[PDB]
Design a binder for this molecule. Structure first.
Ligand SMILES: Cc1cc2nc3c(=O)[nH]c(=O)nc-3n(C[C@H](O)[C@H](O)[C@H](O)COP(=O)(O)OP(=O)(O)OC[C@H]3O[C@@H](n4cnc5c(N)ncnc54)[C@H](O)[C@@H]3O)c2cc1C
Length: 371
């Protein structure tokens, strides 16, 4: 009854926003999702996601999508490999644990979520630019100069959201590490040396402060990421131009001088690199207790943190579960109280996850680290 005759708008059709949409809409709420991506066919760059039983999988179950997730997810082994290609540990998958946290492609996840929504729930090509309250409703203005209205706004548009003002003025901060990601499509053909070294398992390696993570089978592509402490020179002078492949390759081949040729080949064979400083949206300061209209935040928009904890999507999916529950479970007598309780709970597990992620980051990039 809280949401009677209420138009709810979710900003962002990432995993968290689509899951929030589903959890509300299945209860007959009036939901719209605004997504900047041009259309549903847009390729989502990055690695695979794994849903944990007590958070992400619980959200999928509550949404009716757990078996669909299992159908499309792949259980993956993991090898810890030294810089010379020697496997130090092979942690293959046990049929016992195949459903513990199988890896799902990000586009596959978006599709099962989209398929669970009514048609035309997501409005594509809508990059929200301004969000200001008018009367008792929010005014949403998009890059394409269109405008829309809503009674409640849930911000789920990622860690770099520019529309957080009415919730908090806290700013994103860099943590001191940097990540470079890329894909090699059809790796069996195009990087056979490294693909064979992976041996059908995810690969992790750490050397001289440089971490390499790779997944040889993300829907026909090998995805890899190289992470390190941000060079201090970058702080003032830019040394690597991430629009110039050859600039990136020259830097990485320098860093990877001591590594086996199969790793150097992987770098030489990548057509395009994506470089990003690790960031956090810290939960140190409380959010604003006075807001002009109902608004809150979920996912990375709420608690962006370094991904080396394996945290990330599962916290966001718990946000959607708790916020959706609060809004539909009859326990609260206003939207504001339902939101405030959600934020209370999220700050709790969010602060915990952020603290673990910073510890792990400090440990993983120390020169003594060994997995
Ligand atoms: C290098 C790296 C590796 C990671 N690895 C993992 C991992 O292994 N496991 C894990 O669980 N997590 C991982 N994470 C984190 C995980 O990807 C995020 O937690 C997760 O994607 C957050 O989902 P979200 O829906 O909050 O935001 P996002 O996935 O960022 O989705 C936000 C959506 O909003 C859209 N959007 C943005 N701005 C606007 C706008 N103005 N208007 C409209 N729409 C907009 C975006 O296009 C996008 O669709 C990793 C993160 C990084 C950076």
């Amino acid at each position: 009854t809280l949401l009677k005759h209420k138009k709810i708008t979710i900003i962002g059709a990432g995993p968290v926003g689509l899951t929030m949409a589903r959890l509300l809409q299945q209860n007959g709420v009036d939901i719209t999702v605004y997504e900047r991506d041009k259309d549903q066919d847009a390729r989502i760059f990055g690695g695979t996601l794994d849903l944990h039983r007590d958070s992400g999988q619980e959200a999928m179950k509550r949404a009716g999508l757990l078996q669909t997730y299992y159908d499309l997810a792949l259980p993956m082994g993991v090898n810890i490999v030294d810089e010379k290609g020697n496997i130090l540990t092979t942690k293959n998958v046990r049929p016992e644990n195949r459903f513990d946290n199988p890896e799902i492609n990000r586009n596959d996840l978006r599709t099962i979520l989209l398929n669970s929504l009514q048609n035309d729930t997501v409005i594509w090509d809508r990059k929200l630019v301004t969000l200001e309250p008018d009367k008792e409703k929010w005014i949403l203005t998009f890059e394409d100069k269109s405008s829309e209205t809503a009674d409640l706004v849930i911000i789920a548009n990622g860690g770099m959201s520019k529309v957080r003002k009415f919730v908090t003025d806290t700013e994103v901060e860099e943590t001191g590490t940097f990540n470079i990601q890329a894909d090699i499509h059809q790796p069996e053909v195009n990087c056979p040396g490294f693909f064979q070294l992976c041996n059908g398992n995810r690969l992790m390696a750490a050397h001289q402060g440089n971490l390499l993570f790779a997944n040889p089978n993300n829907n026909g592509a090998l995805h890899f990421g190289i992470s390190f402490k941000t060079p201090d020179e970058w702080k003032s002078k830019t040394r690597v131009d991430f629009q110039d492949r050859n600039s990136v390759v020259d830097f990485l081949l320098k860093k990877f001088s001591d590594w086996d040729e199969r790793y150097k080949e992987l770098i030489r064979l990548t057509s395009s690199f994506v470089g990003l400083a690790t960031r956090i949206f810290p939960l140190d300061k409380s959010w604003k207790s006075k807001r002009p209209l109902p608004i809150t935040m979920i996912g990375d928009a709420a608690h962006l943190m370094p991904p080396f904890a394996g945290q990330g999507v599962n916290s966001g999916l718990m946000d959607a579960l708790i916020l959706s529950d609060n809004l539909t479970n009859g326990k609260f007598n206003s939207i504001e109280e339902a939101i405030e309780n959600y934020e209370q709970q999220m700050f709790a597990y969010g602060r915990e996850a952020q603290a673990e992620s910073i510890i792990n980051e400090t440990e993983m990039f120390s020169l003594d680290f060994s997995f």
